[PDB]
């Protein structure tokens, strides 16, 4: 149907917009702390602590399958990256502090993304 096609074009355009958001967020992580999954071969105890691991490569795989239906879903995954890091790592660490700075800088990007998603429909 044409109605199905139109819904598909919309998911594609959301995907485009979320790609540009993901790129802008990931620029705020020049150390690439959040680029890849925590390896269970180097933090063997990770999954005892963190139930839903998340990282930018994992988000990118989902995005490329058009797996985010709305900005809320994408934000949930970004928040997991930050929140997981702030739990596993202590306040005094480079990791915890990198998550704080990512959250702060990412807020700006997501504020405007919400306006664009709402505005364009
Ligand atoms: Na903690």
From Swiss-Prot:
Record function comment: Scaffold subunit of various histone acetyltransferase (HAT) complexes, such as the MOZ/MORF and HBO1 complexes, that acts as a regulator of hematopoiesis. Plays a key role in HBO1 complex by directing KAT7/HBO1 specificity towards histone H3 'Lys-14' acetylation (H3K14ac), thereby promoting erythroid differentiation.
Places the protein is found: Nucleus; Chromosome
Designated name of the protein: Bromodomain-containing protein 1
Tissue: Highly expressed in testis.
Full-protein residues shown: 555 to 674 of 1058
Species for this entry: Homo sapiens (Human)
Signal peptide: none
Bromo domain location: 9-113
Cross-link Glycyl lysine isopeptide (Lys-Gly) (interchain with G-Cter in SUMO2): where in chain: 41
Subunit structure: Component of some HBO1 complex composed of KAT7/HBO1, MEAF6, ING4 and BRD1/BRPF2. Component of the MOZ/MORF complex composed at least of ING5, KAT6A, KAT6B, MEAF6 and one of BRPF1, BRD1/BRPF2 and BRPF3. Interacts (via PHD-type zinc finger domain) with unmodified histone H3. Interacts (via PWWP domain) with dimethylated and trimethylated 'Lys-79' on histone H3.
């Amino acid at each position: 149907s044409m109605e199905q096609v139109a819904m598909e074009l919309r998911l594609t355009e959301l995907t485009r917009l979320l790609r540009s958001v993901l790129d802008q967020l990931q620029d705020k992580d020049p150390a690439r702390i959040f680029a890849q999954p925590v390896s269970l071969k180097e933090v063997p105890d990770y999954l005892d602590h963190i139930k839903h691991p998340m990282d930018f490569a994992t988000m990118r795989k989902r995005l490329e399958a058009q797996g985010y239906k709305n900005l809320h879903e994408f934000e949930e995954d970004f928040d997991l990256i930050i929140d997981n890091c702030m739990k596993y790592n202590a306040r005094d660490t480079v990791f915890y502090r990198a998550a704080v700075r990512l959250r702060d800088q990412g807020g700006v990007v997501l504020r405007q993304a919400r306006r664009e998603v709402d505005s364009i429909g």
